Amino acid sequence: SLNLDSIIGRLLEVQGSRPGKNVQLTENEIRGLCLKSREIFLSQPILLELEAPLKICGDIHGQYYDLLRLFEYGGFPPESNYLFLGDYVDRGKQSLETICLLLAYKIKYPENFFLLRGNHECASINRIYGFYDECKRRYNIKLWKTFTDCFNCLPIAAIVDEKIFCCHGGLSPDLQSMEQIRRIMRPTDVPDQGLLCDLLWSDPDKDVQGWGENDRGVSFTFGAEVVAKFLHKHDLDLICRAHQVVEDGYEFFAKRQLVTLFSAPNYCGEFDNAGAMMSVDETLMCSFQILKPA
Amino acid sequence: KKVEWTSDTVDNEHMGRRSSKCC
Ligand SMILES: [Zn+2]
Ligand SMILES: [Zn+2]
């Protein structure tokens, strides 16, 4: 039947504890989270149409205790609406607790809480970068495959009040109309090339004019004038993206026409970066809240 | 509506902030 409130309560019990303390749900509880959230994802559009006010977060990458701190600053649900831009698993020590809390909040408040797909919500990536190993050690392989079946149904992009375009990676040279996003059928894997790939993998680059090759070996880079023509063609004010670690937790691009959000401080036990969360009120007036390392 | 920014938000596009991709 899925005791959501008991799951959420145990996930929050370690709030304020020796950072790194595990929450070991049962296998059936986690599978219930995956099966229920998967239903909700498929029942909602692959291109979300959201409305302010809300708070937007970037990569978490298994830093569960930093995620709990974000909620302390911005208000635990349902006090605030939330949109996460992807990359919940891999790299960090506690991907499981991270993704379970987010899925539980998705099930609990399916209209005030939203999760986008990042490039790490993909079996071929998170098999390698930590999530699979965490599943093997703490549960079993079959649970990882259940997570994959859920990740394959995550929405890809969101538009907030018809003026803010949100995705994990960035723009595609194959993105002519938002209909190409709505057309993608779920469940799906992330292809090695094309629109869905670029939406999860591409980066902005100040030294590129049109489209350049991406250092990652996947997808493309895009320049400041690609942003302008996109925003103008689709009557938008801002592109909100993640996917890239940034010193301040946020970083503007192309005269504040694009912003990069990263929410995991001291990423990979390195960098000494900070994390940021972007608050949007109902007027579409936007601000940043900074999460410094701890 | 229109996206505007609060008076305390700093524009850091040209301030030489560090960025990175993989670890
Ligand atoms: Zn990413
Ligand atoms: Zn990432």
Residue numbers in the entry:
A (entry chain C): 6 to 299
B (entry chain D): 39 to 61
Provide the authors' original text about this structure.
Protein Phosphatase 1 (PP1; 37.5 kDa) is the most widely expressed and abundant serine/threonine phosphatase. All phosphoprotein phosphatases (PPPs), including PP1, require two metal ions at their active site (M1 and M2), which activate a water molecule to hydrolyze the phosphate group from substrates. Inhibitor-3 (I3) is an ancient inhibitor of PP1 with putative roles in PP1 maturation and the regulation of PP1 activity. In addition to a canonical RVxF motif, which is shared by nearly all PP1 regulators and inhibitors, and a non-canonical SILK motif, I3 also binds PP1 via multiple basic residues that bind directly in the PP1 acidic substrate binding groove, an interaction that provides a blueprint for how substrates bind this groove for dephosphorylation.
